[PDB]
Design a protein around this ligand. Sequence first.
Ligand SMILES: O=P(O)(O)O[C@@H]1[C@@H](OP(=O)(O)O)[C@H](OP(=O)(O)O)[C@H](OP(=O)(O)OP(=O)(O)O)[C@H](OP(=O)(O)O)[C@H]1OP(=O)(O)O
Ligand SMILES: [Cl-]
Ligand SMILES: [F-]
Ligand SMILES: [Mg+2]
Ligand SMILES: [Mg+2]
Ligand SMILES: [Mg+2]
Length: 134
Amino acid sequence: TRTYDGDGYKKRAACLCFRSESEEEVLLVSSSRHPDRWIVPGGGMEPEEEPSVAAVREVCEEAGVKGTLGRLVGIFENQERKHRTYVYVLIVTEVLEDWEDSVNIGRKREWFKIEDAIKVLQYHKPVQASYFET
Ligand SMILES: O=P(O)(O)O[C@@H]1[C@@H](OP(=O)(O)O)[C@H](OP(=O)(O)O)[C@H](OP(=O)(O)OP(=O)(O)O)[C@H](OP(=O)(O)O)[C@H]1OP(=O)(O)O
Ligand SMILES: [Cl-]
Ligand SMILES: [F-]
Ligand SMILES: [Mg+2]
Ligand SMILES: [Mg+2]
Ligand SMILES: [Mg+2]
């Protein structure tokens, strides 16, 4: 069930899933519709779902990782697609081998240096590239 702010923007949550507290390497996942593209794992908040809970749930489903939830980075609008996304830091402590989207749609995941994550997000996902700007 998709949820919306009062202005009709889709409510989303995502995590910057870092390999370590150094925040040098981040986990991206393949696009479901376009598997040759990389995106930040995240997705729609459910009714009455806290954004931090939605963020952790979505990165479990999409990326097959768990870890220590860190700070809210910010709230990022996508004016073109009418999304409003809460973005959190997650320090990955668990990497699971056969996760929901790997089983269901063969979703891929890969570690990127921050600079390279920004590079591969820029063309299709410039708002997700901006998640890293701070
Ligand atoms: O417009 P396009 O570019 O097609 O954006 C897609 C997006 O594709 P990209 O892979 O290019 O990012 C999807 O993400 P992935 O399934 O790949 O993760 C979904 O986004 P979300 O993460 O919010 O959703 P979910 O909770 O993970 O399913 C989807 O939303 P939806 O599933 O609710 O229809 C969204 O459509 P909208 O614009 O209608 O929002
Ligand atoms: Cl790291
Ligand atoms: F989803
Ligand atoms: Mg999802
Ligand atoms: Mg979802
Ligand atoms: Mg998603």
